[PDB]
Amino acid sequence: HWGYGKHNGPEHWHKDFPIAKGERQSPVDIDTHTAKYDPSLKPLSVSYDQATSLRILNNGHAFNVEFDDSQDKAVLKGGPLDGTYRLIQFHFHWGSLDGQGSEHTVDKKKYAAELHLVHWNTKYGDFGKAVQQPDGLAVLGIFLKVGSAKPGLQKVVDVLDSIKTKGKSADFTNFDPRGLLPESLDYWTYPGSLTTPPLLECVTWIVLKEPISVSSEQVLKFRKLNFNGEGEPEELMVDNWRPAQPLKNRQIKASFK
Ligand SMILES: OC[C@H]1O[C@@H](O)[C@H](O)[C@@H](O)[C@@H]1O
Ligand SMILES: OC[C@H]1O[C@@H](O)[C@H](O)[C@@H](O)[C@@H]1O
Ligand SMILES: OC[C@H]1O[C@H](O)[C@H](O)[C@@H](O)[C@@H]1O
Ligand SMILES: NS(=O)(=O)c1ccc(F)cc1
Ligand SMILES: NS(=O)(=O)c1ccc(F)cc1
Numbered sequence: 590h591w592g593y594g595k596h597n598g599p600e601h602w603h604k605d606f607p608i609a610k611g612e613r614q615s616p617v618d619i620d621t622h623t624a625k626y627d628p629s630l631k632p633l634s635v636s637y638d639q640a641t642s643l644r645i646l647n648n649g650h651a652f653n654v655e656f657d658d659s660q661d662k663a664v665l666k667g668g669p670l671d672g673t674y675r676l677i678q679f680h681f682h683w684g685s686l687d688g689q690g691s692e693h694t695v696d697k698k699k700y701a702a703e704l705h706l707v708h709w710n711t712k713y714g715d716f717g718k719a720v721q722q723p724d725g726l727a728v729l730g731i732f733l734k735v736g737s738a739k740p741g742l743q744k745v746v747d748v749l750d751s752i753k754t755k756g757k758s759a760d761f762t763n764f765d766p767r768g769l770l771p772e773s774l775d776y777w778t779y780p781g782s783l784t785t786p787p788l789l790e791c792v793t794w795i796v797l798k799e800p801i802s803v804s805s806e807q808v809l810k811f812r813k814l815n816f817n818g819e820g821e822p823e824e825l826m827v828d829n830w831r832p833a834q835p836l837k838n839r840q841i842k843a844s845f846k
Protein backbone atom coordinates (compact mmCIF):
# COMPACT_ATOMS: atom_id res chain seq x y z
CA HIS A 590 0.00 0.00 0.00
CA TRP A 591 0.83 3.70 0.03
CA GLY A 592 3.29 5.49 2.27
CA TYR A 593 6.04 8.10 2.20
CA GLY A 594 9.13 6.15 1.12
CA LYS A 595 10.86 6.17 -2.24
CA HIS A 596 8.87 3.16 -3.40
CA ASN A 597 5.36 4.04 -2.21
CA GLY A 598 5.44 7.79 -1.59
CA PRO A 599 3.67 10.80 -3.10
CA GLU A 600 5.14 10.29 -6.60
CA HIS A 601 3.56 6.82 -6.79
CA TRP A 602 0.10 7.58 -5.36
CA HIS A 603 -1.47 8.53 -8.71
CA LYS A 604 -1.24 4.92 -9.95
CA ASP A 605 -3.87 3.79 -7.43
CA PHE A 606 -5.50 7.18 -6.73
CA PRO A 607 -5.67 9.00 -10.09
CA ILE A 608 -7.26 12.05 -8.46
CA ALA A 609 -3.72 12.74 -7.22
CA LYS A 610 -3.37 14.69 -10.51
CA GLY A 611 -6.75 16.39 -10.07
CA GLU A 612 -7.89 19.99 -10.24
CA ARG A 613 -8.00 20.84 -6.53
CA GLN A 614 -5.30 18.86 -4.78
CA SER A 615 -3.66 19.75 -1.47
CA PRO A 616 -1.40 20.93 -0.02
CA VAL A 617 -0.40 24.07 -1.95
CA ASP A 618 2.11 26.83 -1.57
CA ILE A 619 0.46 29.93 -0.10
CA ASP A 620 1.80 32.95 -1.99
CA THR A 621 1.09 35.59 0.62
CA HIS A 622 1.40 38.48 -1.83
CA THR A 623 -1.15 37.04 -4.27
CA ALA A 624 -3.61 35.97 -1.54
CA LYS A 625 -6.41 38.54 -1.39
CA TYR A 626 -8.41 39.81 1.58
CA ASP A 627 -12.01 38.60 1.22
CA PRO A 628 -14.61 40.83 2.89
CA SER A 629 -17.30 38.18 2.34
CA LEU A 630 -15.70 35.86 4.90
CA LYS A 631 -17.73 35.78 8.11
CA PRO A 632 -16.06 35.67 11.53
CA LEU A 633 -14.46 32.27 12.19
CA SER A 634 -15.75 30.37 15.24
CA VAL A 635 -13.65 27.60 16.75
CA SER A 636 -15.94 26.20 19.48
CA TYR A 637 -14.08 23.41 21.27
CA ASP A 638 -15.22 23.96 24.89
CA GLN A 639 -17.24 20.70 25.04
CA ALA A 640 -14.79 18.53 23.08
CA THR A 641 -14.65 14.86 24.09
CA SER A 642 -11.35 13.24 23.14
CA LEU A 643 -11.37 9.45 23.25
CA ARG A 644 -8.31 7.68 21.93
CA ILE A 645 -4.95 8.08 20.21
CA LEU A 646 -4.02 5.71 17.37
CA ASN A 647 -0.82 5.05 15.38
CA ASN A 648 -2.27 4.24 11.95
CA GLY A 649 1.06 3.64 10.22
CA HIS A 650 1.06 7.08 8.58
CA ALA A 651 0.66 9.45 11.55
CA PHE A 652 -1.03 9.38 14.94
CA ASN A 653 -4.68 10.44 15.26
CA VAL A 654 -6.34 11.85 18.37
CA GLU A 655 -10.00 10.87 17.98
CA PHE A 656 -13.09 12.66 19.30
CA ASP A 657 -16.70 11.78 20.02
CA ASP A 658 -18.53 13.20 17.01
CA SER A 659 -21.95 11.71 17.91
CA GLN A 660 -23.33 15.14 18.90
CA ASP A 661 -22.51 18.79 18.28
CA LYS A 662 -19.67 19.34 20.73
CA ALA A 663 -16.37 20.62 19.31
CA VAL A 664 -17.36 22.43 16.11
CA LEU A 665 -15.97 24.83 13.51
CA LYS A 666 -18.24 27.42 11.87
CA GLY A 667 -18.07 30.77 10.13
CA GLY A 668 -15.29 32.04 7.93
CA PRO A 669 -15.78 30.46 4.50
CA LEU A 670 -18.02 27.73 5.89
CA ASP A 671 -21.73 27.22 5.26
CA GLY A 672 -23.13 25.45 8.32
CA THR A 673 -21.57 23.42 11.11
CA TYR A 674 -18.54 21.16 10.93
CA ARG A 675 -17.86 18.66 13.69
CA LEU A 676 -14.36 17.77 14.91
CA ILE A 677 -13.57 14.08 14.38
CA GLN A 678 -9.77 13.83 14.78
CA PHE A 679 -6.51 15.69 14.66
CA HIS A 680 -3.07 14.58 13.52
CA PHE A 681 0.26 16.05 12.44
CA HIS A 682 2.75 15.84 9.58
CA TRP A 683 6.43 16.37 10.37
CA GLY A 684 9.96 16.08 9.09
CA SER A 685 13.19 14.24 9.80
CA LEU A 686 14.82 17.66 10.46
CA ASP A 687 13.39 21.00 11.63
CA GLY A 688 13.73 22.53 8.13
CA GLN A 689 10.95 20.42 6.63
CA GLY A 690 7.74 18.71 7.66
CA SER A 691 4.83 20.98 6.81
CA GLU A 692 2.50 20.20 3.91
CA HIS A 693 1.41 23.73 3.11
CA THR A 694 4.24 26.21 2.59
CA VAL A 695 4.20 29.99 2.99
CA ASP A 696 6.05 31.79 0.19
CA LYS A 697 7.77 28.41 -0.31
CA LYS A 698 8.91 28.28 3.38
CA LYS A 699 8.57 24.86 4.97
CA TYR A 700 7.76 24.66 8.67
CA ALA A 701 8.89 21.83 10.99
CA ALA A 702 5.41 20.33 11.21
CA GLU A 703 1.73 20.97 10.55
CA LEU A 704 -1.33 20.15 12.68
CA HIS A 705 -4.61 19.21 10.96
CA LEU A 706 -7.88 19.43 12.90
CA VAL A 707 -10.38 17.51 10.74
CA HIS A 708 -14.09 18.33 10.71
CA TRP A 709 -17.09 17.06 8.72
CA ASN A 710 -20.19 18.94 7.59
CA THR A 711 -23.12 17.85 9.74
CA LYS A 712 -25.64 18.32 6.91
CA TYR A 713 -24.32 15.02 5.50
CA GLY A 714 -24.88 12.96 8.64
CA ASP A 715 -21.62 10.98 8.78
CA PHE A 716 -17.99 11.39 7.75
CA GLY A 717 -18.37 8.72 5.07
CA LYS A 718 -21.20 10.58 3.36
CA ALA A 719 -19.38 13.88 3.83
CA VAL A 720 -16.42 12.60 1.74
CA GLN A 721 -18.80 12.18 -1.18
CA GLN A 722 -19.51 15.94 -1.19
CA PRO A 723 -17.57 18.95 -2.50
CA ASP A 724 -18.09 20.75 0.83
CA GLY A 725 -17.96 17.70 3.06
CA LEU A 726 -14.89 18.53 5.16
CA ALA A 727 -13.10 21.47 6.74
CA VAL A 728 -9.50 21.10 7.91
CA LEU A 729 -7.97 23.71 10.20
CA GLY A 730 -4.22 23.69 9.56
CA ILE A 731 -1.68 25.13 12.01
CA PHE A 732 2.05 25.39 11.40
CA LEU A 733 4.62 24.34 14.00
CA LYS A 734 8.00 26.04 14.35
CA VAL A 735 10.68 25.00 16.81
CA GLY A 736 11.35 27.33 19.72
CA SER A 737 9.67 27.42 23.11
CA ALA A 738 7.67 24.41 24.28
CA LYS A 739 3.91 24.24 23.72
CA PRO A 740 2.49 23.18 27.10
CA GLY A 741 -0.78 21.97 25.60
CA LEU A 742 1.12 19.56 23.35
CA GLN A 743 3.01 17.82 26.14
CA LYS A 744 0.27 15.31 27.02
CA VAL A 745 0.37 14.16 23.38
CA VAL A 746 4.16 13.85 23.41
CA ASP A 747 4.23 11.84 26.62
CA VAL A 748 1.75 9.21 25.38
CA LEU A 749 3.65 8.45 22.14
CA ASP A 750 5.89 5.80 23.74
CA SER A 751 2.71 3.72 24.27
CA ILE A 752 1.71 3.83 20.57
CA LYS A 753 5.13 3.40 18.98
CA THR A 754 4.07 1.04 16.18
CA LYS A 755 1.32 0.78 13.62
CA GLY A 756 -1.92 -0.54 15.05
CA LYS A 757 -1.34 0.51 18.65
CA SER A 758 -3.80 2.77 20.46
CA ALA A 759 -4.25 4.21 23.94
CA ASP A 760 -6.95 5.95 25.91
CA PHE A 761 -6.71 9.71 25.44
CA THR A 762 -9.70 11.14 27.28
CA ASN A 763 -9.97 14.64 28.74
CA PHE A 764 -7.61 16.32 26.28
CA ASP A 765 -8.35 19.96 25.40
CA PRO A 766 -7.46 20.73 21.76
CA ARG A 767 -7.75 24.46 22.51
CA GLY A 768 -4.24 24.23 23.94
CA LEU A 769 -2.86 23.61 20.43
CA LEU A 770 -4.02 26.92 18.91
CA PRO A 771 -2.00 30.13 18.46
CA GLU A 772 -3.33 33.45 19.76
CA SER A 773 -4.55 34.78 16.41
CA LEU A 774 -7.17 33.23 14.15
CA ASP A 775 -6.02 35.13 11.05
CA TYR A 776 -6.12 32.62 8.19
CA TRP A 777 -5.90 31.79 4.52
CA THR A 778 -8.55 29.61 2.86
CA TYR A 779 -8.96 27.72 -0.39
CA PRO A 780 -10.76 24.62 -1.73
CA GLY A 781 -8.68 21.44 -1.81
CA SER A 782 -8.36 17.81 -0.94
CA LEU A 783 -7.23 15.25 1.58
CA THR A 784 -3.42 15.21 1.56
CA THR A 785 -3.25 11.41 1.92
CA PRO A 786 -4.89 8.69 -0.18
CA PRO A 787 -7.71 8.59 -1.12
CA LEU A 788 -6.93 12.29 -1.88
CA LEU A 789 -10.63 13.16 -2.10
CA GLU A 790 -11.53 16.69 -3.23
CA CYS A 791 -13.90 17.47 -0.37
CA VAL A 792 -12.00 19.93 1.83
CA THR A 793 -12.33 23.60 2.62
CA TRP A 794 -8.84 24.38 3.95
CA ILE A 795 -8.42 27.02 6.65
CA VAL A 796 -4.72 27.56 7.35
CA LEU A 797 -3.80 29.82 10.26
CA LYS A 798 -1.15 32.46 9.59
CA GLU A 799 0.40 32.40 13.07
CA PRO A 800 2.47 29.26 13.80
CA ILE A 801 2.61 27.68 17.19
CA SER A 802 6.00 27.17 18.79
CA VAL A 803 6.96 23.72 20.03
CA SER A 804 10.26 22.68 21.55
CA SER A 805 12.94 20.67 19.81
CA GLU A 806 12.39 17.95 22.41
CA GLN A 807 8.66 17.77 21.60
CA VAL A 808 9.19 17.26 17.85
CA LEU A 809 12.09 14.85 18.48
CA LYS A 810 9.59 12.60 20.23
CA PHE A 811 7.29 12.63 17.18
CA ARG A 812 10.28 11.32 15.22
CA LYS A 813 10.68 8.28 17.51
CA LEU A 814 7.39 6.81 16.31
CA ASN A 815 7.43 3.95 13.79
CA PHE A 816 5.63 3.48 10.47
CA ASN A 817 5.96 -0.29 10.88
CA GLY A 818 4.12 -2.69 13.13
CA GLU A 819 5.41 -4.42 16.22
CA GLY A 820 8.09 -6.98 15.50
CA GLU A 821 8.80 -5.63 11.99
CA PRO A 822 11.94 -3.80 10.86
CA GLU A 823 11.99 -0.34 12.39
CA GLU A 824 11.14 2.51 10.00
CA LEU A 825 11.07 5.84 11.78
CA MET A 826 7.86 7.81 11.23
CA VAL A 827 9.41 10.94 9.72
CA ASP A 828 8.78 12.97 6.57
CA ASN A 829 5.10 11.98 6.47
CA TRP A 830 4.20 15.08 4.39
CA ARG A 831 3.01 15.48 0.81
CA PRO A 832 4.72 18.29 -1.14
CA ALA A 833 2.82 21.25 -2.56
CA GLN A 834 0.62 20.52 -5.57
CA PRO A 835 -0.37 22.74 -8.51
CA LEU A 836 -2.76 25.55 -7.64
CA LYS A 837 -4.59 25.28 -10.98
CA ASN A 838 -7.87 27.25 -11.15
CA ARG A 839 -7.89 28.43 -7.52
CA GLN A 840 -7.41 31.58 -5.49
CA ILE A 841 -6.31 31.73 -1.87
CA LYS A 842 -8.32 34.20 0.20
CA ALA A 843 -7.17 35.93 3.37
CA SER A 844 -9.29 36.75 6.41
CA PHE A 845 -7.17 39.80 7.21
CA LYS A 846 -6.59 43.10 5.48
O1 LIG B 1 -10.82 17.82 29.45
C1 LIG B 1 -10.67 18.47 28.19
C2 LIG B 1 -11.82 19.42 27.96
O2 LIG B 1 -13.01 18.60 27.91
C3 LIG B 1 -14.20 19.34 27.64
O3 LIG B 1 -15.27 18.47 27.55
C4 LIG B 1 -14.43 20.34 28.77
O4 LIG B 1 -15.62 21.09 28.54
C5 LIG B 1 -13.23 21.27 28.88
O5 LIG B 1 -13.41 22.16 29.97
C6 LIG B 1 -11.96 20.45 29.08
O6 LIG B 1 -10.82 21.31 29.08
O1 LIG C 1 -13.87 39.92 -11.60
C1 LIG C 1 -13.28 40.46 -10.42
C2 LIG C 1 -13.15 39.41 -9.36
O2 LIG C 1 -12.16 38.46 -9.81
C3 LIG C 1 -12.07 37.32 -8.98
O3 LIG C 1 -11.11 36.47 -9.51
C4 LIG C 1 -11.66 37.72 -7.56
O4 LIG C 1 -11.73 36.60 -6.70
C5 LIG C 1 -12.57 38.80 -7.01
O5 LIG C 1 -12.09 39.26 -5.75
C6 LIG C 1 -12.73 39.95 -8.00
O6 LIG C 1 -13.72 40.87 -7.53
O1 LIG D 1 -5.77 14.17 28.22
C1 LIG D 1 -5.05 13.13 27.57
C2 LIG D 1 -4.33 12.22 28.54
O2 LIG D 1 -3.31 13.00 29.18
C3 LIG D 1 -2.51 12.26 30.08
O3 LIG D 1 -1.94 11.17 29.42
C4 LIG D 1 -3.37 11.73 31.21
O4 LIG D 1 -2.57 10.93 32.06
C5 LIG D 1 -4.50 10.88 30.65
O5 LIG D 1 -5.39 10.51 31.69
C6 LIG D 1 -5.27 11.65 29.60
O6 LIG D 1 -6.18 10.76 28.97
N1 LIG E 1 0.02 3.81 -5.61
S1 LIG E 1 0.55 3.43 -4.16
O1 LIG E 1 -0.58 3.06 -3.37
O2 LIG E 1 1.39 4.48 -3.72
C1 LIG E 1 1.53 1.96 -4.32
C2 LIG E 1 2.86 2.08 -4.67
C3 LIG E 1 3.64 0.94 -4.81
C4 LIG E 1 3.05 -0.28 -4.58
F1 LIG E 1 3.82 -1.40 -4.71
C5 LIG E 1 1.74 -0.42 -4.23
C6 LIG E 1 0.96 0.71 -4.11
N1 LIG F 1 -4.20 15.17 5.99
S1 LIG F 1 -5.70 15.63 5.84
O1 LIG F 1 -5.96 16.15 4.54
O2 LIG F 1 -6.07 16.45 6.98
C1 LIG F 1 -6.73 14.19 6.00
C2 LIG F 1 -7.85 14.24 6.82
C3 LIG F 1 -8.69 13.14 6.90
C4 LIG F 1 -8.40 12.04 6.15
F1 LIG F 1 -9.23 10.97 6.21
C5 LIG F 1 -7.31 11.96 5.33
C6 LIG F 1 -6.46 13.06 5.25
Ligand SMILES: [Zn+2]
Binds near residue numbers: 680681682705784
Ligand atom coordinates in the same frame (compact mmCIF):
# COMPACT_ATOMS: atom_id res chain seq x y z
ZN1 LIG G 1 -3.16 15.85 7.51
